[PDB]
Write a structure and sequence with these properties.
The protein is an all-beta fold. Helices cover 0% and strands 22% of the residues. Strand 2 and strand 3 form a beta hairpin. The radius of gyration is 9 Å and the shape is globular. It comes from Pireneitega luctuosa.
């Protein structure tokens, strides 16, 4: 199972994203997971 769009990555960076999405980590611990571009 993968995370949807805009879904933050577990804790700080545990699970991955769907086939095509990524996980950003701006000024904050809770990284965000969403589509590529």
């Amino acid at each position: 199972a993968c995370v949807g769009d805009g879904q933050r990555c577990a804790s700080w960076s545990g699970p991955y994203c769907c086939d095509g999405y990524y996980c950003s980590c701006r000024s904050m611990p809770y990284c965000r997971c969403r589509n590529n571009s």
